[PDB]
Write a protein that binds this ligand. Structure first.
Ligand SMILES: Cn1c(=O)n(C2CCCC2)c(=O)c2cc(Cl)c(C(=O)C3=C(O)C=CCC3=O)cc21
Ligand SMILES: Cn1c(=O)n(C2CCCC2)c(=O)c2cc(Cl)c(C(=O)C3=C(O)C=CCC3=O)cc21
Ligand SMILES: [Co+2]
Ligand SMILES: [Co+2]
Lengths: 381, 381
């Protein structure tokens, strides 16, 4: 069931912003690693004396990477006179964020019809304000509320190119990398307690609990009216024998935060081939491959949907496959993006639910937990 | 003249250590960008609950990248019980360094016969101590004194694999990249005042002023007995019309620090081809090419040393060429390595001075300052 109870008009995921200590180096690593083009900058060369910000794009996916300059460059400025293109930026908040969490996501940004309204209704409905609505060059309105930990949910709206004050990067610097990634499918948070996190977030957005369908997790997924903004949230399951990865996250991250970003590919096989080509020459590493018994059991479960060749192609690249009652899900997980065992990336592709494809088609992989336990039974097979 | 007045036995450059906020991402960028292999780690997977450290190697060149974990992982430790493989590391110093300077070099490390002696004699002779000598697993001794700004000169000595507590990385993770870079030739500091910086450093090392031979700089080069450790130091020339780049460095870096690392290649042409192949897909950018009039004038100056083809090959890659009274120098400069216009890299190759090649053969490029002014005269040619 879908109550469609959004308290304001939500469009799509708009961008993800990483807070870094050096934005240049993270952005160049991510660009090679994921096949994302350099498409806009805001930094010293564009008159920004406050922060360096570099935008990477692949399809509709927008990864923003921001780091602070020395405060002494902008010490003579005040908020009315600022050179920062993102007015919510704060030297102190950014340094504290990065020293506390290391590299990670500061903002999950969603486009909305009216960001000032979305902020007002949100704060009216329990949201902890983070940065009040600000109208940039009479063109774009930007507002931030607290989502969980030190991650903000960022509203952006356009009357009618990323943000004012950003320049398009010179194409001689802009190499058209592309490994098939196209949009953000879901962004997932880890918290110590799922209940209060849920009722807080659903409280101020009006997002509803999404469909879906004993290892470490309890989760639930919040979704907008058309279920194109998908916001899962995890909590640890204490007391088990293998320590909860959610609990390991909270310890190394110093509390709640964004656990993983799921990027949709239009061709998960080409994406995974290309990312695996570059794992050891600057790119990203991937979780260990499941045992071939896993793949010796997928014929009995999705042989309907994938040919005997594609199932073997899955075995090469280490792809995981799950299946809702409507669609099928292909998914794989990277190793952590940085020093800490905290944030990681998930590459996915969804097959089914044609009307366009409806959101969350196939789910998030729920069945693959029990299916990997009863496949790591291969020790005598 | 060479007094050979080293106050202790100095061998060669041993490694350069960058202090970062995320060591993983800088190291992977640098590895792709410079063609350096991953050869050793010390991090959570090796029991280090304090810092993540990743070593890149090309030839004898060793780039070390270190970032702090959350202090809470090691809060129950004391210095006698530490899990840090580098005992001089300090969460507070590292965070303060990186928030103050951004990405940059924390240590210039030189191998010496006896690091405890080198520290004692150094401190006896004016050196500001930074970390006292510590003997690691009865195998390696490590000591640090202040060099300039927040950069330390690090002494290391071996009784008889990088450091104890580092592991060699699994070769499946270790891709044998190589673009021809082989060793560190010189490491250069910017300071506000050259005199006191000079007499401080020469004071405690016994290094002597090196050979050599109106834009922005005053410099001088300190050198060990065999002149294989070369430590130039710059100061700004105020009052000119084009603001001193040294002065721009001091402002954006928040004071003195390491300005550039010069890496020797055994084939500057293959190095520059390979690095330029990767500039826009994660690697490093290079300074703007000099005008072809520069290259139309190199025949008259080094046509003795380089064929008409190699001189044109220089023009492709943007290589600069200078000439001492003994040798010839090929050199080119990258754009800054990170967000700030502070640290950058220089690729060089030296031709001449065969006895082995003697240090500093060809100099450091002194003649190329006046030669670029009187070549940017091409506006009417
Ligand atoms: C399917 N699956 C899995 O099998 N494992 C295996 C791999 C071997 C050991 C345990 C995971 O670790 C794993 C981890 C995550 Cl975060 C997800 C995931 O995407 C996810 C969501 O998007 C939303 C809510 C909960 C949720 O779990 C799926 C996983
Ligand atoms: C030769 N040369 C040059 O021509 N320029 C040009 C390029 C167009 C505008 C000015 C430089 O900026 C430049 C910069 C540096 Cl740091 C060096 C260099 O390596 C160096 C040392 O190693 C040691 C002491 C001093 C010193 O200067 C050489 C340069
Ligand atoms: Co997921
Ligand atoms: Co130099």
């Amino acid at each position: 069931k879908n109550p469609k109870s959004d308290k304001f008009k939500v469009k799509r995921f708009h961008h993800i912003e990483f807070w870094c200590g050096d934005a240049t180096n993270v952005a160049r690593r991510f660009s090679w690693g994921l096949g994302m083009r350099f498409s806009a900058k805001s930094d010293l060369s564009t008159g920004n004396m406050v922060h360096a910000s570099y935008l990477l794009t692949s399809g509709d996916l927008r990864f923003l990477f921001t780091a602070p300059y020395s405060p002494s460059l902008s010490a003579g400025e005040i908020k009315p006179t600022t050179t920062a293109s993102i007015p919510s930026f704060d030297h102190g908040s950014c340094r504290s964020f990065f020293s506390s969490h290391g590299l990670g996501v500061r903002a999950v940004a969603i486009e909305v019809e009216d960001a000032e309204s979305a902020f007002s209704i949100s704060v009216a409905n329990g949201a902890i304000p983070s940065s009040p609505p600000i109208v940039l060059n009479e063109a774009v309105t930007i507002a931030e509320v607290k989502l969980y930990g030190d991650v903000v949910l960022r509203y952006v709206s356009y009357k009618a190119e990323f943000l004012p004050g950003f320049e398009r990067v010179e194409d001689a610097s802009s190499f058209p990398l592309d490994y098939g990634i196209r949009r953000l499918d879901h962004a997932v948070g880890n918290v110590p307690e799922l209940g209060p996190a849920l009722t807080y977030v659903a409280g101020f957005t009006g997002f509803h609990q999404f469909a879906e369908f004993e290892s470490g997790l309890n989760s639930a997924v919040l979704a907008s009216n058309d279920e194109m903004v998908l916001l899962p949230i995890n909590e640890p399951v204490h007391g088990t024998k293998r320590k909860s990865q959610i609990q390991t996250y909270l310890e190394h991250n110093e509390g709640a935060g964004l656990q993983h970003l799921a990027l949709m590919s239009e061709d998960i096989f080409r994406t995974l081939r290309e990312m695996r080509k570059r794992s050891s020459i600057g790119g990203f590493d991937f979780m260990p491959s499941p045992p071939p018994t896993y793949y010796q059991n997928l014929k009995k479960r999705v042989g309907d949907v994938l040919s005997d060749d594609q199932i073997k192609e899955c075995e090469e690249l280490g792809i995981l496959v799950d299946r809702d009652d409507q669609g099928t899900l292909l998914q794989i997980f990277t190793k952590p993006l940085g020093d800490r065992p905290t944030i990681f990336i998930e590459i996915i592709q969804r097959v089914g639910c044609m009307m366009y494809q409806s959101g969350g088609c196939g789910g998030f992989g729920k069945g693959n937990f029990s299916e990997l336990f009863k496949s790591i039974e291969e020790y005598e097979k």
